[PDB]
Amino acid sequence: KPYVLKFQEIRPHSEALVGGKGMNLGACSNIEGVHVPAGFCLTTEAYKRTLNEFTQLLQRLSEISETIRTLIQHTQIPSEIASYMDATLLDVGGYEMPFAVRSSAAGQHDTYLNIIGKDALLQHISMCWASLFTERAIIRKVQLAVVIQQMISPEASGILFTADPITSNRKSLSIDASFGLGEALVSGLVSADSYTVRENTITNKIIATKKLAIYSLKEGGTETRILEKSQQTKQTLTDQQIIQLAKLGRKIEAYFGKPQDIEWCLAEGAFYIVQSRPITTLYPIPEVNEPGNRVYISVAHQQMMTDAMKPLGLSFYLMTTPATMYTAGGRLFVDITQSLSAKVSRDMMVNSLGQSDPLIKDALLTVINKKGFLPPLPTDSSSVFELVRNSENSIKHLKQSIETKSGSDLFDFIVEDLEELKRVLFNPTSIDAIMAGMDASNVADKLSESAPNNITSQMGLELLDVADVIRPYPAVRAYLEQTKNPDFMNELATLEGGAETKKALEDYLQKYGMRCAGEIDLTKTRWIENPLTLIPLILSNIKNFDSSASMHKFAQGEKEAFHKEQEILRAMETKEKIDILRHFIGYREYPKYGMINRYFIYKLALLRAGEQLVKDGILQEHEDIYFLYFEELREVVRTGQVDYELINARKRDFATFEKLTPPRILTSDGEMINGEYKRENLPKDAILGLPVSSGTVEGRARVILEMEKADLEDGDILVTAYTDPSWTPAFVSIKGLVTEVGGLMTHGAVIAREYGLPAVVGVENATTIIKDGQQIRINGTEGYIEI
Ligand SMILES: Nc1ncnc2c1ncn2[C@@H]1O[C@H](COP(=O)(O)OP(=O)(O)O)[C@@H](O)[C@H]1O
Ligand SMILES: [Mg+2]
């Protein structure tokens, strides 16, 4: 409550009084052995008493802020606030000395360098209040504060990262060094060098053509020019100055406990710190107990599912998998350090996951040959139909036994049923079945086209079946395209056709509504929980199709399958080898279908177990159970208590985890190791990936993440992060496929070869580089855009 706060007198955690930037300076001030330019902060309550008229306008949209901005400029600061300003300013050099006017709120406001005089500073303080109402700051009522510290006139300045911004390696240190002052509004006109330090050794130096530099002229800041070889020839910092700055950086990192973003200035051989912020863009570290250097591999990349998962979702995958895993950033990992400490164990993993995709193999070889990260090495055909029915009989008994149970023994029941889930999924008979399919295997693929009893194939095909019973009744499309409303399946009967489509739509939801995009995450909304997700894909099947499209495109397959059956005819060992393949491989996607069925049954049982948690007065909202791990959730039910400061923490963490993309290889130092494609005799421009389906075509790119933005017309090419079996019904309206992750024999990869759809997977950052709308080119090998 003091009007003016000096840096070394700032109270921990009261940001609201001083602001983030000021609290940072108030923290770096107490760091022994670190020089922070003396100064103080104008209390946010000085911004408040400087204000009856001002409220005239904060009600008016509780672009003419150019009157409310000039008001604060013309509104003069009270004599006492001005007096307190005079005292603390005189203690840090007084007037006749230069100071920096910096505002402290995320976002950005106005900061003014090198201001001298009482009148000039009073004006700039008011201009900083004005920065709150330029049409940028606009898109409530908050309190701003102003930092006033000694203006440094350095030879060099720049930024410092205690962790490599790209690789996220915490034992790496990046420095951006440039001559002259820093910029409040950074423009690409003051370039800088880039140094990289691991520990006391320089690992990388990038010198830049720095033609321009900002110098604090007697008052204000002119931008002079440097001599041609004062740019090139001169490192911004000497080899020792870089190391000195590095040590200076990790002394601040050790103080805050977190990797910091530090702004520095260099005057007369001495360094000064003007700002320090925690880095919030790093990929988190798996919480593991034994101390050595560790290498983790991404389960996400193995499962072709890179999206972040909620706690409860992570739990159910952990309980499903026998192998011990670890969680980091909403993704799961497997510690393979033990297998990379033995030569026999090393190779057997490299060539097992290697040719599957060179990115993993390259990433493995990357970590293996690192600078001593790792220790050196010291001197049956009738089998199908029952497995299907046994699965169906295993689901029916589960579903009518969960409605039986609730409370605490509900969790006792799920844990037990997970064991049954295991011996159905890991059933030797079930995996001996498709071993026969895969061992039955160029010539083999198209010979296996249009094989019945494939659960995901029917899902895509029956959607077309659904599409053609829907269609005559025109009367049912207008309502469909404005509906923001999830419960659209109620007003179908008030209209004609909608009743007869509902029956066809509900029958679909009975067999295929249990899936979704990323079924692996149990907490993710299924199709029957929100049928509004299938709207575009069904409309897309409506916008372009037949009376019985499911018949023909199915029909297409077996006749091209019916002219290859005997190119080879004109040797009867081969005839059923083809079938024991054909009549089987449709089952290769049923264990997946059987598992996620049990998922949804648990979910409904757990959700209603959460609905009783809101009526007991324990839960605020319904689906907050997603942010608790399984065992935590067991205890909340057994107790009647719960920490919501953890829940909200889980909520913001998950939101942070969504902006991240998991690495194929993650180290104990946080370093993200993805693979790299080997390329020459291939176009300069080309973005590289993995070949999946032979073919070359071009067309319009549709970068689509959710299956709700899936407005697919004819000549489009689908560009997404991953292709799930639930994504496969969309393969009827596209011409090409580009995914950030995929395999040579995922189901998407299979039906892409049957339809003749050229597809490329393993294309890193494909949903960021390829902007939606661009005409792109794709080839079975590599594929790049056409401007
Ligand atoms: N007291 C100071 N002396 C010299 N340079 C400074 C001082 N304060 C800030 N700067 C420089 O001004 C630049 C702009 O910082 P600032 O505008 O306060 O951060 P933000 O833009 O986040 O508000 C910084 O990069 C820093 O190098
Ligand atoms: Mg800054």
Numbering used by the authors: 2 to 52, 56 to 66, 78 to 120, 131 to 164, 174 to 413, 433 to 494, 509 to 637, 649 to 865
What did the publication describing this PDB structure actually write?
The structure of RPH-Lm reveals that the enzyme features a three-domain architecture including an N-terminal ATP-binding domain followed by a large central domain that binds RIF (the RIF-binding domain/RIF-BD), and a smaller C-terminal domain. Crystallography, small-angle scattering, mutagenesis and enzyme characterization showed that the catalytic basis of RIF modification is complex, involving a two-stage mechanism, with transition of a small C-terminal swivel phosphohistidine domain between two active centres.
The ATP-binding domain (residues 1–314) has a fold characteristic of ATP-grasp enzymes. The ATP-grasp fold is comprised of two α/β domains that simultaneously bind an ATP molecule between them. Notably, in the absence of ADP, the ATP-grasp domain is largely disordered and in the absence of RIF, regions of the RIF-BD are disordered. However, replacement of this residue for Ala had no effect on RIF resistance in vivo and the mutant enzyme was catalytically competent towards both reactions in the ATP-grasp and the RIF-BD. Since Mg2+ ought to be tightly bound to ATP, these results reveal that Mg2+ coordination by Glu297 is not necessary for catalysis. In our RPH-Lm structures, the β-phosphate of ADP and the phosphate on RIF-P are 49 Å apart, implying a significant conformational movement involved in RPH-Lm catalytic activity.
